[PDB]
Design a protein around this ligand. Sequence first.
Ligand SMILES: O[C@@H]1[C@@H](O)[C@H](O[C@@H]2CO[C@@H](O[C@@H]3CO[C@@H](O[C@@H]4CO[C@@H](O)[C@H](O)[C@H]4O)[C@H](O)[C@H]3O)[C@H](O)[C@H]2O)OC[C@H]1O
Length: 396
Amino acid sequence: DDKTITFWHNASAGEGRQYWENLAKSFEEANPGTKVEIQAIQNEDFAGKLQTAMQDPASGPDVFMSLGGAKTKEMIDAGQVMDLTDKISDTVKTDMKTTLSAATFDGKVYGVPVSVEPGGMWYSKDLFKKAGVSDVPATYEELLADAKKLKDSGTDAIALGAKDAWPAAHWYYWLVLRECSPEVYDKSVQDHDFSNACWVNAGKKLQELKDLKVFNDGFLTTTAQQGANSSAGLLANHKAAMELMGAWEPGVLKDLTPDQKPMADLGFFAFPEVAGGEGEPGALMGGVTYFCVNPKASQTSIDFVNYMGEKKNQEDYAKAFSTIPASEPARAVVTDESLKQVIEYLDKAPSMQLWMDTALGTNIGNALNAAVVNMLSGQGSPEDIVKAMQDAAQKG
Ligand SMILES: O[C@@H]1[C@@H](O)[C@H](O[C@@H]2CO[C@@H](O[C@@H]3CO[C@@H](O[C@@H]4CO[C@@H](O)[C@H](O)[C@H]4O)[C@H](O)[C@H]3O)[C@H](O)[C@H]2O)OC[C@H]1O
């Protein structure tokens, strides 16, 4: 049928999963005859399922979460994502002014944003006091020192979901962004040129952290967002003192604490400055979640994504996901102190880089994440991380 639309998101459980049920329901009420069939897919499975399904756009989902950056671009150039420039509502155009750029390719708009999620450090303020850290580290070396203190207090300083590859890679990404100059960074990413010394230097800085042995012991088998022993789970239950992550973090943590209530002592702090690096200080990096429409889809799918962008639904999104909504007016309803700081950093950044693996695409992103994990497991070098990107870059 025609007024029936398949819809894929990655809110696996909890309020987030329920939020989408609720949205579908009240969408169905406002557009009679329409039925929304939902698939809630866990994040690490999502790319695979989306790309298998979209080989046949006719038999794929009508509305789906985007993979972001070059990965969205890869779908556009395959004709798996419909052009929404002349279709997004005026409410979206007005309210998602700053966030729509993440969804814009070749001047054309390809999705509706629901959230913006910068990265940084999320930490236990309680575990920090117990170890003797009264102030958050403004530099990398201070951070590595704070990890030593935290280890001595007999807690795992850093939770790391290395089994999922990307969470470990985020350390690398952040180091490269601080080490490389904005122009070398911007050119490297866009040209797939990884020859500059800032790319090896960053890995060296990451190997330093590795040598400190300050991760949770099972980091190699630790996932990011699955279970109590996932890296968010370790942070949520005060088994580790900090994690490097996107601003989806409070909502994730909230679903992994004993009472499924927000992490009482949660704090945020920007990824520190790095001595000798030439990156624009306080450079932001992060994500923008948005929803794409199947090129082979009907008007009902268009009205659905526009529905997402309406202020009330975005405010509800913010509460359900404990995140920053895309809609600037809906950001009013944000109360979490850590998320407040993140908005402060957001409202004064000159730019935000997308996640590096997202920016570089599937081949280069995957080869990069694996390589970083390999070095961390003592089967790779900072030089090998570079090698790997270069080798995969050959394919395009
Ligand atoms: O390649 C890397 C990416 O994969 C990565 O993807 C992001 C990772 O995490 C995703 O966050 C989602 C968001 O919501 C969670 O569910 C809700 C959380 O809050 C609760 O209130 C609620 O009840 C839940 O439904 C979810 O579990 C989690 O997976 C995110 O959307 C992705 O964009 O980013 C970086 C790349 O390097």
